[PDB]
Amino acid sequence: PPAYTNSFTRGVYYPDKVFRSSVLHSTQDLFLPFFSNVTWFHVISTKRFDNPVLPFNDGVYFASIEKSNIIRGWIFGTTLDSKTQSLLIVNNATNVVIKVCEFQFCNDPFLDHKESEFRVYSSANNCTFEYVSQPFLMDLENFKNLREFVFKNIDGYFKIYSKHTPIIVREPEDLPQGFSALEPLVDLPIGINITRFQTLLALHRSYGWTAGAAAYYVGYLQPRTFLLKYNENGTITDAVDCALDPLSETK
Amino acid sequence: EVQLVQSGAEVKKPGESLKISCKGSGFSFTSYWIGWVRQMPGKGLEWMGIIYPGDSDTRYSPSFQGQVTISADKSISTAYLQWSSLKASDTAMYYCARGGYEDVFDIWGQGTMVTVSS
Amino acid sequence: EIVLTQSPGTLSLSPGGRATLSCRASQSVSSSYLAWYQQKPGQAPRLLIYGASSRATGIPDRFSGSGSGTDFTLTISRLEPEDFAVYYCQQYGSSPPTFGQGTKVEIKR
Amino acid sequence: VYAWNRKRISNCVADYSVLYNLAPFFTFKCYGVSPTKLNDLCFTNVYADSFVIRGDEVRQIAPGQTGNIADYNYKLPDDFTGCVIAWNSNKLDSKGNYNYLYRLFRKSNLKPFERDISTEIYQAGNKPCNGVAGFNCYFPLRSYSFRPTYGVGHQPYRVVVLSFELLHAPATVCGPKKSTNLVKNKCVNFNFNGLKGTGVLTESNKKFLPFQQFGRDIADTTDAVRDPQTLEILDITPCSFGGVSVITPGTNTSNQVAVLYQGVNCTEVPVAIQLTPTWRVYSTGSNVFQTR
Ligand SMILES: *[C@@H]1O[C@H](CO)[C@@H](O[C@@H]2O[C@H](CO)[C@@H](O)[C@H](O)[C@H]2NC(C)=O)[C@H](O)[C@H]1NC(C)=O
Ligand SMILES: *[C@@H]1O[C@H](CO)[C@@H](O[C@@H]2O[C@H](CO)[C@@H](O)[C@H](O)[C@H]2NC(C)=O)[C@H](O)[C@H]1NC(C)=O
Ligand SMILES: *[C@@H]1O[C@H](CO)[C@@H](O)[C@H](O)[C@H]1NC(C)=O
Ligand SMILES: *[C@@H]1O[C@H](CO)[C@@H](O)[C@H](O)[C@H]1NC(C)=O
Ligand SMILES: *[C@@H]1O[C@H](CO)[C@@H](O)[C@H](O)[C@H]1NC(C)=O
Ligand SMILES: *[C@@H]1O[C@H](CO)[C@@H](O)[C@H](O)[C@H]1NC(C)=O
Ligand SMILES: *[C@@H]1O[C@H](CO)[C@@H](O)[C@H](O)[C@H]1NC(C)=O
Numbered sequence: 001p002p003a004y005t006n007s008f009t010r011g012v013y014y015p016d017k018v019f020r021s022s023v024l025h026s027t028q029d030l031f032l033p034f035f036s037n038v039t040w041f042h043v044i045s046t047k048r049f050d051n052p053v054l055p056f057n058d059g060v061y062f063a064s065i066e067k068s069n070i071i072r073g074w075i076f077g078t079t080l081d082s083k084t085q086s087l088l089i090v091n092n093a094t095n096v097v098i099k100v101c102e103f104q105f106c107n108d109p110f111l112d113h114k115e116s117e118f119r120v121y122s123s124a125n126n127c128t129f130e131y132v133s134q135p136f137l138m139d140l141e142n143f144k145n146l147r148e149f150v151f152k153n154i155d156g157y158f159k160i161y162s163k164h165t166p167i168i169v170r171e172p173e174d175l176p177q178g179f180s181a182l183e184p185l186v187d188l189p190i191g192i193n194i195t196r197f198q199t200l201l202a203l204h205r206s207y208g209w210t211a212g213a214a215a216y217y218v219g220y221l222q223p224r225t226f227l228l229k230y231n232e233n234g235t236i237t238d239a240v241d242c243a244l245d246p247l248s249e250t251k
Numbered sequence: 252e253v254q255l256v257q258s259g260a261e262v263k264k265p266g267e268s269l270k271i272s273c274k275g276s277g278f279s280f281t282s283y284w285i286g287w288v289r290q291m292p293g294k295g296l297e298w299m300g301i302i303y304p305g306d307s308d309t310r311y312s313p314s315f316q317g318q319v320t321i322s323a324d325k326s327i328s329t330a331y332l333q334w335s336s337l338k339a340s341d342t343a344m345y346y347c348a349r350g351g352y353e354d355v356f357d358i359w360g361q362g363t364m365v366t367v368s369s
Numbered sequence: 370e371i372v373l374t375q376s377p378g379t380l381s382l383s384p385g386g387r388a389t390l391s392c393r394a395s396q397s398v399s400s401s402y403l404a405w406y407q408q409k410p411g412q413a414p415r416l417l418i419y420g421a422s423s424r425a426t427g428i429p430d431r432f433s434g435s436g437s438g439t440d441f442t443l444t445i446s447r448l449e450p451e452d453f454a455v456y457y458c459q460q461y462g463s464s465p466p467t468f469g470q471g472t473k474v475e476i477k478r
Numbered sequence: 479v480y481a482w483n484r485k486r487i488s489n490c491v492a493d494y495s496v497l498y499n500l501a502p503f504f505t506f507k508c509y510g511v512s513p514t515k516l517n518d519l520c521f522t523n524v525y526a527d528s529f530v531i532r533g534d535e536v537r538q539i540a541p542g543q544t545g546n547i548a549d550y551n552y553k554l555p556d557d558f559t560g561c562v563i564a565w566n567s568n569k570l571d572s573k574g575n576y577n578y579l580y581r582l583f584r585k586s587n588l589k590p591f592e593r594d595i596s597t598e599i600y601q602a603g604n605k606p607c608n609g610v611a612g613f614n615c616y617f618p619l620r621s622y623s624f625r626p627t628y629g630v631g632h633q634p635y636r637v638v639v640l641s642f643e644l645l646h647a648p649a650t651v652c653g654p655k656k657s658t659n660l661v662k663n664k665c666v667n668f669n670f671n672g673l674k675g676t677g678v679l680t681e682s683n684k685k686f687l688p689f690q691q692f693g694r695d696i697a698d699t700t701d702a703v704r705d706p707q708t709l710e711i712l713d714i715t716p717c718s719f720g721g722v723s724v725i726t727p728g729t730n731t732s733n734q735v736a737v738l739y740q741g742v743n744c745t746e747v748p749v750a751i752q753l754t755p756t757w758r759v760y761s762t763g764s765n766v767f768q769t770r
Contacts, residue, residue: 019686019693184689234687281569282629295468354404354466356416
């Protein structure tokens, strides 16, 4: 069952590469609703892992609170089969391995965290766009580090906003109430359309396949206008979404 | 006609730079590829490389690239192989065999039995 | 480049018989189409056969190109005084061509 | 030519002047666009080709023309994007050498922009084409047979067909841009990363976030930008502006006038002030007073 939790103040990302200082810029952008229901999927290890091929829709606000990267990367595609050209993400060592090819996909795709990658993409036919850089999990691997991602695709480009922060306490088992803007890491020149999103889970073996504690949240963004309060350093310290409440409109 | 007369056998004091002469005739240097090959006394020949003679561009053999200096003039139709400096070890039979990457024999020189000794 | 050695160093045999020159290549080179060289005795060598198995331009019908890969086996159906001389298997397609060990024909000392 | 090498060119900063330079590269004529304009235009998914040309037959296979080589080796539409670049491979093909067999006897004409990988022996007569080339059936490929003799007649030409895909996707291949070097503390036009503008440029003490590259104020004008060349950050201030005012005691009461430059520093204005520089602006010898 999808545990539904309020988003509180989450999912805010920098709109563009403009240094705005102490000015309350307003833009209508694909945004996560404030205090919004988001489905919570818990993966504790029988296998409690869930890998449903969720519809990508316009966008997604993915976040992982795992101490160890049980889940590495994601699978995006229109149909996620050999005919469809689907992009791959994986945090193996120091390489993202951003591959966009017609990939035949395993029914249960797992990677050996201690690989099994040739099974998860069975067919490497028709490779078009390939990029390799520093791993997207550039954050360091008492606290449990949290990695938040926003995935979008538009204008023949795939846009990812992300921000990584340590979280001290697991007792809430939900997104902490705090404001943090997801910086623009990469923009991917690929222009393949994606309608369904599948998380790429890594399970080597009993560690049939067991792994550490993990909890990943998925939320869907929609168009909305926000007052983003840039500060003197240009960081968005906080923002108010007009939609949520009658007071918010007035601001 | 395409005939190649090389330098004659010469007694040579070891340690001087000598340009051996291979005459060319009756051929277009760009149209006909020239090569360079030498035989040390009494065993199979050694490659010196192949020359693009229309440009007089000699790509020497990796064994003999820099070991010998090969030059030729398309207009004068006579090679001038500096051979770096001729040394006592350089005593060998030199054959002006035309050829390219295909390494065909084409027309060899008459033979250069240079014995580099005092 | 590829080491070329044709067995034997001297096939001592009577003239007019059929013979083969088994050139040994360290790396199998059929793409070389190696340029067999027949060293005229004490003269400027004439290319025995070019194309490995293809025949040389203006070569007699007895001289037949044969052999490919690591082993080139040039077939000569009738030995002549020209055959009674040193041979060479030399790389044609392969650059830095390597001359063979040589082969010779004789009957008496 | 029968199996010509289609190639894809991407993520390229490509200068085409070098190709024009070589004397063997005598042919770089383009059916598509002017070569001078080409050095500036940007394209994507550039197609390059590899084939061996006698030059006697290139006119038959030239775009806008069809020959038995064009009908079989490579069909090409009359309109041709990009250039046909031909340079003499006279030597490399001479000696002789017959490897590059190219298709001249095929059953049917092929479609434009198509490469025929497989060799199709000409299905000419009703009698079956069994036994490859034979009676009523002919081998497609003809040995290119370039010799020193064929070096002169049917001169060997190493020819590449360059047909750029006309930036249907975002253009990924083109030439040099952004030549001019920067100056500071001067009223100069700028095209920093293609961003046109005019102003006085100075180093910006204000920080930028690593993703942030250009700075916008409350007025949304540009006030700071990270230099494309270097991580040094430049404040951009608009060039000095102002309105002029003339003080006169009346035309009948003499003709001397006094000019007031409103809201501008006295050191900033030379007599060159550019807009309205027609006036001599008197001189520094004339009393100049800096007022609020
Ligand atoms: C992780 O898996 C990917 C493919 O699933 C591979 O990544 C390779 O990483 C090494 C260096 O880290 C490089 O050769 C390339 O970046 C990748 N090779 C490819 C994509 O063929 C590799 O199998 C794994 N990375 C490891 C073990 O470091
Ligand atoms: C915002 O940026 C400014 C400038 O970088 C920071 O202010 C100074 O930062 C340097 C090092 O980053 C320190 O050595 C100084 O002591 C800081 N001075 C002041 C007055 O802050 C500032 O820390 C950044 N953050 C905030 C919230 O202002
Ligand atoms: C999410 O919605 C369901 C009904 O659709 C509701 O029962 C649940 O309480 C909501 N989650 C919240 C309010 O956190
Ligand atoms: C498909 O799921 C089953 C479930 O046990 C298992 O065979 C495996 O996880 C998947 N198949 C492959 C080939 O991995
Ligand atoms: C396959 O790859 C080519 C080039 O890599 C690309 O143009 C094409 O869109 C891809 N997909 C299909 C279905 O051909
Ligand atoms: C899928 O993407 C291609 C380009 O990658 C585009 O041409 C096509 O229209 C898209 N299909 C849609 C949006 O249904
Ligand atoms: C002022 O100027 C007018 C015309 O320019 C002239 O007629 C008049 O006499 C002048 N008066 C004085 C006091 O200068």
